[PDB]
Ligand binder design. Structure first.
Ligand code: HEM
Ligand code: HEM
Ligand SMILES: Cc1cc(N)nc(CCc2cc(CC[C@H]3CCN3C)cc(F)c2F)c1
Ligand SMILES: Cc1cc(N)nc(CCc2cc(CC[C@H]3CCN3C)cc(F)c2F)c1
Ligand SMILES: C[C@H](O)[C@H](O)[C@H]1CNc2nc(N)[nH]c(=O)c2N1
Ligand SMILES: C[C@H](O)[C@H](O)[C@H]1CNc2nc(N)[nH]c(=O)c2N1
Ligand SMILES: [Zn+2]
Lengths: 416, 414
């Protein structure tokens, strides 16, 4: 208890009532005495036990048969019976393809930090549980990228590799995203390319990558299968769609030489379904403009171009109160959105995205009894209070199935 | 129950929080649900029994603050408050405790980005006040001192504490200086839509409204639980700034102005178990409070179409970011205007930068700093300010400013 929880929207006075939070399972890290809502990561070869796994699978199977309006049927009981026996005789169990598709869509649906969840039920699930080698992983991932890119008309997809077993046979993508640019720490302390990727770039070079040492080098895939040491693969360049950034008004903006890739595809999170742990589960969607235009380009520890853009705008940069940073930021974000649209590559501005999410969230409250949301992540990094989410109260809690974080593999891997 | 670390992800600075171990009011979150974006998470007079421990704890931390813990003065100041809660069901704060309590409420204000200034706070003890006329007197002295011809100075005025619920001092205004908002026949709003109800309540009490766009509201002052009385602030005390733009000469043609003095007057100050239901307090503005929220909220002055229209921007699709462009211009105007009229104002880049510096001070000397990221990050340009990337721990320390019910919903007239 309590059975009911109200959220208000302070721009429209609309009030919603949440009962879904009663099904939350994991801890948030908050207590009655302290709130950790702005902490990024709250919360070994160790794996669930038989007794731990029984209730987690039952809970998930019950949920799945509830969703197909067959709860308590004979099929329901026989699925429970089958799974309880696998767990007894093998200490693990295998999802039916229909449960694997359900669990993945619902991990997306339950992702409280995702603003794009109105699309959750339209998600292409690529079952890759038959993969046994890194080459096989590389083939599955290329088909993922091609399907998802779709010549600019991007479609959301996830590829799911074999689940963890004893913890020593994990499948991992070592990339944090399938497509990222490389970062090269120079001897003089400067950074070429993407500073966020300096460490991963160095691991790739050590594993034998020959870097072109440019500003926008796509990194190779580093892929670990069945617990073996990882292996480098170059993504075929014709499968990486990229967009040159230009500005509709400023002639000079193309002279900055900026570009970005089309397909955002997280590959380092763990997918938890019914107590099973899919440690390799790359998933992709399309970009919200500000992810590129504010964070990737203007974060001080990223490409950090505000200074250069402001100079070409001839803004007063001597004091902060001129708001030269804020002016350049908007123009950079107009250019990003202009470029992706002109190339007919799918992208969504932050106004459209937040407005869609408010509608999604209301529908979820209406049809499901709630929608976990992380205000700190849902609100866009620019122009927050002129998007509907800023004024929207949100409840954050953890439903399963879910995408979770997991430690970087180089910290844990045992080299053979 | 450990030390907790917070990390800034831009600078990779890590601070260790021990202070949260001393908090005792609830946040409203649980281990299963986080509520950090709820605005108001969840006869309100404590009895004698609740009151002494609260009081004992406040006196304890006061004497600990002045390096005289367990002293003679401390031993006897305790017995004094014990005896007093006994015989009167309440107790009275010394002048020094009142000032320390007030400054430390500001210091514990998790939602306040401005707290680098917490100890430069002018405290006006108005606990001898007994009537709305006396309240109006103390308030005009506040406004005049805090305005200071444009060199604004932080201040609080503290009216008598709650006793039995029936004798309650309240400023019915949410802020000492606000513009009236008028419901129109055609259904629209002239002036500030945020105060449409309150504007009607003052009309219902005899206020003749100029029905203009920027009408300063009267004070509605309730003393000792009586019906509230209206008062006109002497206009020579209300400092305003006409908003113009340093590039666009058509911006003055918008006819916009705002008041220099932001003064919250609807909150409750809680010190040592005592409740000061009238405690108006004031500082100076961060430019976004006016330029983003007051001017560009939908439920507020809502001037964005107008501005981008005179900027001749493409307003057909959202992805021209025509709202984002017009918002930066409006906020440049606001900052340029105050600075040109030498009225104290702070931009959100400098204010968040100061707050990070304040956070370092507080972790160093106090072992923490409760901070509400949802409220600390500015309503525009978030991730180009240092606070966006700063992890924050939010917890509830007393003394504290609390919310209280709107007065019109509680008051039974006679
Ligand atoms: C289809 C369009 C999509 C849009 C517009 C979108 C948008 C976003 C954005 C802006 C974030 C914040 C990311 C950040 O700032 O780092 C996010 C987070 C996230 N998204 Fe979505 N996303 C989409 C698709 C998906 C899909 C297909 C999945 C999974 C099947 C997904 C799962 C997640 C998860 C788990 C997070 C949390 C990431 C983290 O904690 O680092 N998203 N999304
Ligand atoms: C001196 C300059 C100051 C600045 C620049 C400043 C800035 C701010 C800002 C931007 C907010 C968020 C306001 C909102 O969105 O409603 C805020 C909230 C707050 N401030 Fe400060 N402030 C200052 C002085 C003060 C003083 C003197 C006090 C008390 C003595 C104070 C106590 C508070 C409280 C309690 C809140 C939270 C109000 C709420 O939750 O509604 N501030 N401040
Ligand atoms: C499936 C999916 C769809 C969409 N749209 N976004 C994501 C998040 C991944 C993602 C997020 C961002 C924003 C800036 C990030 C980088 C550091 N800061 C947290 C930049 C990317 F390049 C990226 F790939 C996942
Ligand atoms: C003491 C003190 C100093 C400073 N600088 N700010 C405050 C907050 C008060 C305050 C805050 C705002 C923000 C816009 C509206 C939308 C929500 N919020 C009420 C608009 C004001 F007009 C105002 F007065 C208090
Ligand atoms: C729902 C949410 O709590 C609400 O809109 C908050 C968000 N953060 C805020 N932050 C500030 N500074 N001021 C506000 O009024 C709000 N409103
Ligand atoms: C400190 C804070 O938790 C952290 O910087 C968060 C803020 N909100 C965010 N929101 C999104 N979408 N992505 C982020 O990386 C962050 N970073
Ligand atoms: Zn919380």
């Amino acid at each position: 208890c309590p059975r009911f929880l109200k959220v208000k929207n302070w721009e429209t006075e609309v009030v919603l009532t949440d009962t879904l939070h009663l099904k939350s399972t994991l801890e948030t890290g908050c207590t009655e005495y302290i709130c950790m809502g702005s902490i990024m990561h709250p919360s070994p070869e160790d794996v669930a036990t038989k007794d731990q796994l029984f209730p987690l699978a039952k809970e998930f199977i019950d949920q799945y048969y509830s969703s197909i309006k067959r709860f308590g049927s004979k099929a329901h009981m026989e699925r429970l019976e089958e799974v309880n026996k696998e767990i007894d005789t093998t200490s693990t169990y295998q999802l039916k393809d229909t449960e694997l598709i359900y669990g993945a869509k619902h991990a997306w649906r339950n992702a409280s930090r995702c603003v794009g969840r109105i699309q959750w039920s339209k998600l292409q699930v690529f079952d890759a549980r038959d993969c046994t080698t890194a080459h096989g992983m590389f083939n599955y991932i290329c088909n993922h990228v091609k399907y998802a890119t779709n010549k600019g008309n991007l479609r959301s997809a996830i590829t799911i590799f074999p689940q963890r077993t004893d913890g020593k046979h994990d499948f991992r993508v070592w990339n944090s995203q399938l497509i990222r640019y490389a970062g090269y720490k120079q001897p003089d302390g400067s950074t070429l390319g993407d500073p966020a990727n300096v460490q991963f770039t160095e691991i790739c070079i050590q594993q034998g990558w020959k870097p072109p040492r440019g500003r926008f080098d796509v990194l190779p895939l580093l892929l670990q299968a069945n617990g073996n040491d990882p292996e480098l693969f170059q993504i075929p360049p014709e499968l990486v769609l990229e967009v040159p950034i230009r500005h509709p008004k400023f002639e000079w903006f193309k002279d900055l030489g900026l570009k970005w890739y089309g397909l955002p595809a997280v590959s380092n999170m763990l997918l938890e379904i019914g107590g099973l742990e899919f440690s390799a589960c790359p998933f992709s969607g399309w970009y919200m403009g500000t992810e590129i235009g504010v964070r990737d380009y203007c974060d001080n520890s990223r490409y950090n171009i505000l200074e250069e853009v402001a100079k070409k705008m001839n803004l007063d940069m001597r004091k902060t109160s001129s708001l030269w940073k804020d002016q350049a930021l908007v123009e950079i974000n107009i250019a990003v959105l202009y470029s992706f649209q002109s190339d007919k590559v799918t992208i969504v501005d932050h106004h459209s995205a937040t407005e869609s999410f408010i509608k999604h969230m209301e529908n979820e409250y209406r049809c499901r009894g709630g929608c976990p949301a992380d205000w700190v992540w849902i609100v866009p990094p620019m122009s927050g209070s002129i998007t509907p989410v800023f004024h929207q109260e949100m409840l954050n809690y953890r439903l399963t199935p879910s995408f979770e974080y997991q430690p970087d593999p180089w910290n844990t891997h045992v080299w053979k």
